[PDB]
């Protein structure tokens, strides 16, 4: 299973990847957790600490791998072998999960940022189409990661909105860029979800094929997130929502 | 002065460019033409042949230029120095004119173009901010070849367009691109008009002060630009309008 799950800033989108992988670590053999957001941790809410989240280094800051695999002596590979690597790029969280964080893509103008974005093109490349492992690999909304190439092994993208007509849009824009890049299955998860009233205004605006599942609204995540307890530990009452969630997705994938 | 002739394919702009170009030969010791749009000639309208101008090398292809300017040994210099060189990117066309041609800007996934660009991009800089003599550079309606730091010596931006809805809103989105750049002076010029009715569309879609004037469509650019022959020659009736048009444009400039 290749899962890619994107969603706009704050609607808790690094929280449900985090679930599924979490979900998804007792029926696979290995997971490839892949950070593709520098503005949420994916390996804290996965359990890990400040620390040992900060000391698995980003893709992008990864120098010396990046110019021995574009190449030196007026060599520029921007299309680098690096699948036999990918284990060297991140660390165990457990026996299980393999967490890659791909760290800040920049643009800037005046420089040449080829090499750097050259190198976490080839690493998501290798992810995505040459190893057997199940991936799953949050970004933004803008899912710039992927690429036409890519997006033929994404199993499914899982779009995370909000019930509210804003965060529909954003949904419905992730899933035209994803169908663009090639992306064959777009589903939906509805997260924060307080009352039924917005349950139905998800299912007017949104055909119910498309819906994976909704999550509702739970402090927990907040007074449970701001001290190292897991979140998706069986305490939760919305972490069923997620395993229902799950079950739906493992039957669309097959 | 500094001027920028912006336009949609097939507007006539690079006609509009080489008019204004050949008119203020006469009142500048010297005149650099800027052909930016490889989609038309900016050369062979201004009366070189096919071959002439196929001779005048595009900076887009000095290779050696490009790497000498750009840097070796580990370097990377992407603003190099090129004024004391702009001279030796081009063709004197006459003892007045002198023509550079950008040629191709290339994007195209799967490899670097800083360098590239990057002296595409220090000759601009090089013409616009540190020359002293009048420069004249044409453009596609995406004004790409412009940046925040030459946009502030370009005196004024014309774009040019025909009398109808279609082109008014293309007008109307390099007026937008061009302001958001810095540029102070955006001005229209109508080409092609046909009849009064359309000369009225303009007029209610455009404030009447940043009409720069009308060009008549006239049979003979065309029948004229097909062979050898200048079409700017006092024969041409149009050839008013543009004089009048280029007075107009002076008398804002100061
Ligand atoms: N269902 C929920 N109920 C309440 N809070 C939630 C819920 N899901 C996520 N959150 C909280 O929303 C905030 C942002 O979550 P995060 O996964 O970082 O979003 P994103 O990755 O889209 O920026 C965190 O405080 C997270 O705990
Ligand atoms: N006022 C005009 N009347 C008739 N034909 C014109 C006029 N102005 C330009 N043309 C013709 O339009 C065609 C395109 O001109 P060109 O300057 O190459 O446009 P652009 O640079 O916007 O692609 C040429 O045949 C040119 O002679
Ligand atoms: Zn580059």
Chains 1, 2 share one sequence.
Request: aromatic share 6%; proline share 3%.
């Amino acid at each position: 299973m290749k899962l890619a799950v994107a969603g706009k800033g704050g609607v808790g989108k690094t929280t449900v990847a985090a679930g599924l992988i979490k979900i998804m670590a007792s029926d696979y053999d290995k997971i490839y957790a892949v950070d593709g957001d520098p503005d949420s941790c994916l390996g804290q809410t996965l359990g890990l600490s400040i620390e040992e989240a900060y000391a698995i280094t980003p893709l992008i800051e990864m120098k010396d791998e990046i110019r021995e695999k574009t190449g030196d002596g007026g060599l520029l590979i921007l299309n680098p072998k690096v699948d036999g690597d990918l284990d060297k790029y991140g660390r165990y969280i457990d026996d299980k999960i393999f967490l890659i964080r791909m760290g800040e893509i920049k643009k800037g103008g005046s420089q040449c940022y080829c090499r750097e974005n050259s190198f976490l093109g080839s690493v998501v490349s290798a992810l995505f189409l040459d190893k057997k492992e199940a991936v799953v690999m949050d970004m933004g909304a803008g899912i710039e990661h992927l690429t036409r190439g890519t997006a033929k092994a994404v199993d499914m993208m899982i779009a995370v909105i909000e019930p509210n007509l804003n965060s529909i849009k954003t949904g419905l824009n992730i899933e035209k860029l994803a169908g663009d890049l090639g992306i064959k299955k777009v589903r939906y998860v509805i997260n924060k979800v307080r009352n039924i009233k917005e349950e139905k205004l998800i299912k007017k605006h949104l055909p119910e094929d498309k819906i994976l599942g909704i999550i509702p609204y739970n402090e927990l995540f907040i007074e449970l997130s701001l001290k190292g307890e897991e979140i998706w530990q069986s305490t939760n009452p919305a972490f069923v929502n997620l395993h229902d969630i799950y079950q739906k997705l493992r039957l669309e994938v097959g």
